[PDB]
Amino acid sequence: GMELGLYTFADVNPNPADGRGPEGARRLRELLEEIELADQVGLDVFGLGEHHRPDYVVSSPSTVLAAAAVKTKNIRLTSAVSVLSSDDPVRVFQQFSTVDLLSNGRAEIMAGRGSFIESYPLFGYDLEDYDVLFAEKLDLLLALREQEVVTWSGTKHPAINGRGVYPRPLQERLPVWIAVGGTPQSVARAGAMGLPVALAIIGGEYRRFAPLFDLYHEAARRAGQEKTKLRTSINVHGFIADTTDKAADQFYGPQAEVMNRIGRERGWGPTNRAHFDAARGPEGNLFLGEPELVAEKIIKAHGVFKNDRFLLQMAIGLMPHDQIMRGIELYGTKVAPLVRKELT
Amino acid sequence: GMELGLYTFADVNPNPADGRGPEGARRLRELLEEIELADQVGLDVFGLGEHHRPDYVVSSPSTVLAAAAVKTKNIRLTSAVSVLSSDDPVRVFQQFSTVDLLSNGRAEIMAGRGSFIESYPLFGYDLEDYDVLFAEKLDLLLALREQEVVTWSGTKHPAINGRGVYPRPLQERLPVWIAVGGTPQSVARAGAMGLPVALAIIGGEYRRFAPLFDLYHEAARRAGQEKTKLRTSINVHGFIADTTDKAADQFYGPQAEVMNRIGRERGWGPTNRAHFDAARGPEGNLFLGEPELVAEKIIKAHGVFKNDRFLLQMAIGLMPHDQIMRGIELYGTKVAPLVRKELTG
Numbered sequence: 151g152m153e154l155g156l157y158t159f160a161d162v163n164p165n166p167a168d169g170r171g172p173e174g175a176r177r178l179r180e181l182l183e184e185i186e187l188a189d190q191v192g193l194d195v196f197g198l199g200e201h202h203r204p205d206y207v208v209s210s211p212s213t214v215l216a217a218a219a220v221k222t223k224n225i226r227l228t229s230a231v232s233v234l235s236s237d238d239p240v241r242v243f244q245q246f247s248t249v250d251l252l253s254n255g256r257a258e259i260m261a262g263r264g265s266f267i268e269s270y271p272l273f274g275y276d277l278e279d280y281d282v283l284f285a286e287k288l289d290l291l292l293a294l295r296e297q298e299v300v301t302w303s304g305t306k307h308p309a310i311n312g313r314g315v316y317p318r319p320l321q322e323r324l325p326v327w328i329a330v331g332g333t334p335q336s337v338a339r340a341g342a343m344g345l346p347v348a349l350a351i352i353g354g355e356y357r358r359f360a361p362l363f364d365l366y367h368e369a370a371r372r373a374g375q376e377k378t379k380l381r382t383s384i385n386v387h388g389f390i391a392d393t394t395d396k397a398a399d400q401f402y403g404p405q406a407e408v409m410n411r412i413g414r415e416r417g418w419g420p421t422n423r424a425h426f427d428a429a430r431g432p433e434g435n436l437f438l439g440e441p442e443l444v445a446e447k448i449i450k451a452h453g454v455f456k457n458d459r460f461l462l463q464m465a466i467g468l469m470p471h472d473q474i475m476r477g478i479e480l481y482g483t484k485v486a487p488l489v490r491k492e493l494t
Numbered sequence: 495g496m497e498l499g500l501y502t503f504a505d506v507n508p509n510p511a512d513g514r515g516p517e518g519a520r521r522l523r524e525l526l527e528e529i530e531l532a533d534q535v536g537l538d539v540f541g542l543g544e545h546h547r548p549d550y551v552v553s554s555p556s557t558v559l560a561a562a563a564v565k566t567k568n569i570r571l572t573s574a575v576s577v578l579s580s581d582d583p584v585r586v587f588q589q590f591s592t593v594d595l596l597s598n599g600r601a602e603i604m605a606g607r608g609s610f611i612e613s614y615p616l617f618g619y620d621l622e623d624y625d626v627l628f629a630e631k632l633d634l635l636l637a638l639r640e641q642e643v644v645t646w647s648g649t650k651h652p653a654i655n656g657r658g659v660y661p662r663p664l665q666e667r668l669p670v671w672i673a674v675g676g677t678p679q680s681v682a683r684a685g686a687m688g689l690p691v692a693l694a695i696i697g698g699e700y701r702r703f704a705p706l707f708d709l710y711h712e713a714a715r716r717a718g719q720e721k722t723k724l725r726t727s728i729n730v731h732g733f734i735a736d737t738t739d740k741a742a743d744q745f746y747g748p749q750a751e752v753m754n755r756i757g758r759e760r761g762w763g764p765t766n767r768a769h770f771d772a773a774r775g776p777e778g779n780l781f782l783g784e785p786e787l788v789a790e791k792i793i794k795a796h797g798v799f800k801n802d803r804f805l806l807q808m809a810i811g812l813m814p815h816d817q818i819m820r821g822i823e824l825y826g827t828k829v830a831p832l833v834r835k836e837l838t839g
């Protein structure tokens with residue numbers, strides 16, 4: 151039925167008192183603790199996103215997921231997202247294949263744009279080439295996973311002339327999800343390819359995205375892709391506490407500081423509590439409150455999307471570790487059983 | 495003091511009965527057990543080399559070292575080697591900085607040629623470009639470790655215009671070692687740049703390599719590099735077991751396929767017993783035998799090289815896991831104390 155998981159970018163203080171090294175080490179300590187607890191309370195997936203900024207510690211999700219692999223038993227381990235357009239698909243495949251071996255078949259790649267642009271100047275790419283870079287590198291990533299020895303050529307990556315890529319993973323077909331978007335063009339591309347898609351619901355009302363899944367399914371059905379192979383996920387922000395009032399009070403500040411920073415860099419004004427209270431209402435984008443309320447919204451959202459997977463981002467900005475740990479607990483032991491029993 | 499460590503390429507059976515996936519999964523589980531034991535018995539360094547072939551499971555040493563980082567306490571964790579010429583130094587720095595954070599300050603990079611010649615086609619390079627690729631990418635890697643925000647340009651890598659590279663590691667200066675095989679040019683360049691060097695001892699009597707370290711120090715002297723920047727290691731093949739005959743038999747046994755690599759690169763065949771026996775004698779390049787024999791050779795080799803670090807590669811070909819585990823135990827509990835007692839006190 152429904153897969154339930156978590157994802158995070160592993161935020162840090164951009165100006166720590168005792169320097170960026172100790173801050174990073176602390177954050178990664180805490181992050182592993184999050185992943186270990188999520189595994190222990192039976193959550194299905196944990197995602198880590200790639201960023202290239204002083205306020206995030208994870209620029210290499212596969213490296214951190216290798217550590218998670220050997221400290222967990224069941225939880226699936228994915229990027230969320232890999233900014234594939236600015237990386238080398240051979241390296242990405244090798245890294246995730248290695249995580250797959252370390253985790254006994256639990257690795258996945260989620261590839262997409264992300265909402266940040268720091269990777270392009272860092273790695274020497276022009277954003278005007280995003281679409282070609284992503285198309286070619288995704289094509290190459292898919293060729294790599296489909297067989298040991300590949301022959302590939304394009305315009306944006308050197309040719310590969312009948313060479314094996316090692317090591318081979320454990321899974322027959324290492325899963326690759328495409329993170330969209332919210333642009334009809336993006337979902338139809340992925341649909342026509344028969345690839346699973348993950349939709350970030352970032353603001354506004356969640357049901358406004360329903361046509362995107364319609365379009366995904368139509369692009370697939372059109373291209374004669376087998377209905378039953380298609381998977382969909384929604385990736386949302388939110389938080390769970392012992393009461394809805396406590397979830398709201400705890401999440402508001404840490405969350406606002408991040409979403410204000412993002413707005414500044416994208417050209418919009420700061421958030422407020424009224425916007426936040428609207429967002430956490432039944433139709434809003436934020437999946438937030440006591441376990442019962444959050445469970446109810448996940449079930450309702452499924453009525454709308456018929457999504458196979460749901461990923462929740464709670465660890466945002468300077469959310470206290472203890473609060474995140476309690477939220478992960480409540481998500482696994484209270485929210486998940488309610489969702490799972492209704493959707494089975 | 496003397497740092498004593500291990501390195502491996504994490505060889506697998508290229509013809510596994512139950513498929514490449516399960517073979518790779520088992521090899522990495524076994525490798526982690528090796529590293530954890532090495533940590534537990536107090537060995538100083540563990541290295542993993544990068545290869546791109548069906549008979550090696552580690553094409554991404556940093557990925558595996560991340561896992562080692564969270565399963566160990568004291569051991570330092572290094573590539574051996576990172577084939578830097580064919581990689582992106584920004585990614586390499588980010589990956590090893592991440593290992594550094596996960597390990598609380600225990601990561602290192604050892605950059606070298608490794609098997610570039612076999613693996614350059616995968617990354618789109620031309621063989622001729624090795625020297626400029628290595629020079630520029632090493633220059634970038636060192637720029638990255640020296641400060642948060644860099645401006646760098648060259649001919650074989652895109653420009654970086656005032657960009658930060660994250661996350662920052664824990665160590666003030668992420669150690670970068672240069673692996674050298676015994677070509678004067680490589681050794682001298684490392685010395686002139688004041689970087690620690692790790693020399694591979696392959697073939698003949700180990701003594702014959704000593705002048706290479708002369709050249710390293712002389713290049714450093716004439717470049718006016720600080721004496722205290724300079725560190726040297728020797729990287730050797732060998733094996734430790736409960737008796738010298740057991741070590742020899744187990745290392746030479748046909749089923750382990752060690753000699754197919756060890757003898758081949760030294761210019762002799764897998765059943766050339768005369769050469770293997772000469773190679774493992776007191777002056778030879780193979781550090782092999784019961785613990786007291788191996789410790790005495792390490793001590794003697796120090797009198798020759800004055801090396802700061804000694805790295806041993808035992809886990810080669812299809813050496814049985816149990817035998818490697820016993821060798822690691824003997825290395826940390828018998829060999830290391832003898833060497834440390836004699837060299838330090």
